[PDB]
Amino acid sequence: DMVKEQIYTIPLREVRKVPAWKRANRAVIEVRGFLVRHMKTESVQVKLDKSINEHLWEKGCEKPPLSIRVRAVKFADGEVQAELAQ
Amino acid sequence: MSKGTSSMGKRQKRTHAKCRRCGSVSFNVHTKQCTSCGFGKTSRMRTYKWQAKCKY
Amino acid sequence: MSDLSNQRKLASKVLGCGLDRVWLNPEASEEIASAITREDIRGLIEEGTIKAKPVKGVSRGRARALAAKRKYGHCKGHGSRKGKKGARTPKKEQWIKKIRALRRRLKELRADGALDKSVYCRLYRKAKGGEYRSVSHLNSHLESEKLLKKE
Amino acid sequence: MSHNMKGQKKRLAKAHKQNTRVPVWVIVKTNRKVVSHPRRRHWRRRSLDVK
RNA sequence: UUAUGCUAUCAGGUGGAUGGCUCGGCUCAAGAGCUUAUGAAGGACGUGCCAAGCUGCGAUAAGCCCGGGGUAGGUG
RNA sequence: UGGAGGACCGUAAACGGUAUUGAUCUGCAAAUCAUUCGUGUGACCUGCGUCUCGUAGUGAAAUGCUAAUCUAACCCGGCA
RNA sequence: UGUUCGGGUCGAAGCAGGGCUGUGAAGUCCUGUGGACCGUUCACAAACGAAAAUCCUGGUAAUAGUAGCAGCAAAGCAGG
RNA sequence: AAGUCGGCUUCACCCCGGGACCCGUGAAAAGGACAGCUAAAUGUCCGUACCGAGAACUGACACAGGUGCCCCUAGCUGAAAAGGCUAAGGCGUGUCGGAGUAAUUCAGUUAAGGGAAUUCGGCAAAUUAGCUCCGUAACUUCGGGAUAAGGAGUGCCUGCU
RNA sequence: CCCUAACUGGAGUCCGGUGAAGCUUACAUUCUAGUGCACAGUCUAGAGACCUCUAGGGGGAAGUGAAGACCCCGUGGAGC
RNA sequence: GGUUUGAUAGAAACGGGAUGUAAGCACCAAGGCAACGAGGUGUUCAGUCCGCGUUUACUAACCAUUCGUUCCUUUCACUU
Ligand SMILES: [K+]
Ligand SMILES: [Mg+2]
Ligand SMILES: [Mg+2]
Ligand SMILES: [Mg+2]
Ligand SMILES: [Mg+2]
Ligand SMILES: [Mg+2]
Ligand SMILES: [Mg+2]
Ligand SMILES: [Mg+2]
Ligand SMILES: [Zn+2]
């Protein structure tokens, strides 16, 4: 069951250094890496909600947001569940 | 248009068909002759002495 | 699930749609994977497991608003015209409509007794000669010259 | 959809059924001495000289 | 434990030389020497229980019939 | 009004091949690519069919073209 | 090849390395490996000796974990 | 599940008719029609899958060429089958990925002030650009030059002729 | 162009996978001069030089590609 | 360089900046019988944004590993 239920604002400015058409999956990778380091889990145990992925791809592959606010929950199995947050 | 690979894309036809008499794909579809065995030109089989060397 | 690609192709054939129009239930994947025949696909289609997604057309409403304004004579000025005057209104069609209107007007005037054959012939040749811009111009010439046999 | 006569299609059919591997029992019988034959081919290569 | 290397040998890998073997080839000699409309040679296609090639055979299709030789195995 | 012309503009329709002396130059390609260009109702372009060939043919003629071969093709033979 | 005299499964030819002899061409022996053939006298023959031919055929390096897997249509991501 | 109606337009398709041009005249033959109606029987043979091309063809290739763009193609903008944005249909295989950090390089965007001083040479790039109206020179074979040149306008909304 | 700068995408750079080719008698960390078939990394005398690796543009290797197509020669050709 | 004995990076807020006054709402709007109506004004130096700073341990600088011994050994300065 749940262990921690913290809300995060994940900055995505480092995503912008990548070539412009690669920015959306670079931002996906940044969100996953942020969750890995801040929740202290593995990359494969970080599950990204459809809200997060659809928000990162809203304006195309070249214009992801400069930040994203997410709600991540960690379980005893080590799995992390991340969803978009208001 | 280059004389090389470009003009080689127009190769969608044939000048020689399969020969009834000999089975070789040598029957000229225009001259109606087999260039291998002579079918469609002669009742005999096409043979020349220059098909081998002078036997000496 | 292994490939459901065979089922998707068969379902697009059975539904008569494109391959990507076919929707396979992501929850009923093993039910779909057991479907081998056209009858099985028809059963899945009838029970809603397989359906054809709605065609996303091209909406034409904002074109309708623009077309209404253009019918009123707006949104059609010189900064909107791109084709030559002649591609937007061909000249032979203009002449055809003009001369046909004039000739029909003259024919009806001769028929209903307002115009005798002598002046009808000359008016017909005048219309053929581009003397009148329209039916209104021809009527105005008739009334100014008093060529109509009024009673 | 080129149009073949009866004989041209028969020769194509013979070419097609020649393009089969040697049977496994032949390989067993010959003690791995006959494992292939010269009529193996692929359809997308130098074409047939048959039709 | 001085790496990257250099030289020689050894073990192994790769490779297919060498040797040995050979139902094949080549040359010479002696024989024998025409065949096909009674449809030849040649080719195509087919033909095997599992058979793709070659070989044989021809819808009687790796074969059918008769006589002789051979005799216990055969099914290229 | 009419609708002529080896008329005009123009298509990454089709045909051609100017310049970049660009890319490429063990290439995507034994001649291609991008951009820029010429023709685009006519001596037009093009499919299929058919004919004309080696001292011969074909050529609005460059010795161009005749199967990546052309101031005499290619194959075999003369030929060791 | 003719001819004389031999060796070999108690291990021939060949192969890798070594000892000895010979100015040398080379010969012989030893160890290992190998599994069936090999020499020798006097003579006679020849399709008889290779480091070279941008030699031929096969095998295999350096180059090098390098070039390429970009340019003409930059396409993938989440969840299952 | 509805499944009933109207209207507009109509290419690039069908029918029909006219005109113009030619020192160019634009195929032939089978077949068909003009007297056939009713019944029964017969209609053999070959092809037929699939690709038809940025992977099924051809160029040694899953080849940026060629064959074929050969014949077809929906909505808006627009003269348009241009270009752009979208359907349907086809795809994410014009079959390597990751990473985001140097120089250099292929292809682009922008650039003060100057404006061809560059260079063999304005090569390359930039400028202009649609449509409407005004206006248009030398010269001319009287046809043209000509879109010469040079000027003005252009969006949206409301109401109209 | 003065006189270049910044930025965009693709390469490159670094990582994983895949994976060739072309120069090569040998050796080789060179530099200067001389010498020598008079244009030397190797000869001579000096001067330098610890090795390995990476990136980088191309000074040199009279770099690589091609039995010079210019010239002459050949009692060699071809066409005209 | 910093690593809780901490402002290293990020969040939050604020400072300092970029742009130019968001959406919705109300009033006006040439006119239209009306429906509507480009647009103007107020709300509103608003809205959006910051690859700068500050404050602030809120999350992450945690948990380790490895060398500083030739390795096995008792060729031991050792310990079952
Ligand atoms: K079909
Ligand atoms: Mg040629
Ligand atoms: Mg002879
Ligand atoms: Mg034109
Ligand atoms: Mg010869
Ligand atoms: Mg040798
Ligand atoms: Mg890459
Ligand atoms: Mg002489
Ligand atoms: Zn023949």
Helices first, then strands: H and E counts in chain A = 2, 5
Relative to beta strand B16-18, strand A67-75 is unpaired
DSSP string, C114-141: SS-HHHHHHHHHHHHTT--SSHHHHHHH
What is the C-alpha separation between A45 and A32, in angstroms, rounded? 10
Check the CA dihedral A32-A34-A39-A43 and report its sign: positive
- A82 phi and psi, to 5 degrees? -115, 135
User: How many angstroms away from the CA of B11 is the closest CA of chain D?
Assistant: 13
Phi, psi (rounded to 5 degrees) for A34: -55, -50
Which residues from D are below 8 Å from B18, CB to CB? 11, 50-51
Method used for this model? cryo-EM
| d(C-alpha B25, C-alpha B17), whole Å | 5
Distance B27 CA to H38 C1' (A): 56
Measured in Å, residue C94 CA sits from the centre of ligand 8 at 94
Cα distances from B23 to residues B34, B37, B41, D4, D46, in angstroms, run 10, 9, 16, 17, 19
How far D46 CA sits from the closest chain B CA (Å)?
13
DSSP state of A68: E
Amino acid identity, residue C73? Answer: G
**C105: which residues sit within 8 A by CB, 6+ positions away?**
C135, C138, C139
Q: Assess contact for A64 and A15: CB atoms under 8 A.
A: yes
| Continuous segment of H or E residues that includes residue A10 | strand A7-11
One-letter amino acid at C119 equals: V
Ligand 2 mean position to B39 CA, how many Å? 31
Nucleotides of G under 7 A from a protein CB: 74-80
User: How many CA atoms within 13 Å lie on the side-chain side of B50?
Assistant: 0
For residues C18 and C12, is the Cβ–Cβ distance under 8 A?
yes
Q: Over C90-110, what HEC string results?
A: CHHHHHHHHHHHHHHHHHHHH
The two three-digit tokens of residue B35, written as one number: 């260039």
Q: Cα separations (Å) of C123 from B21, C132, C135, C138? A: 87, 10, 12, 9
Resolution (A): 2.4
Distances (CA, A) of D48 to A25, B8, C44, D17: 49, 18, 45, 13
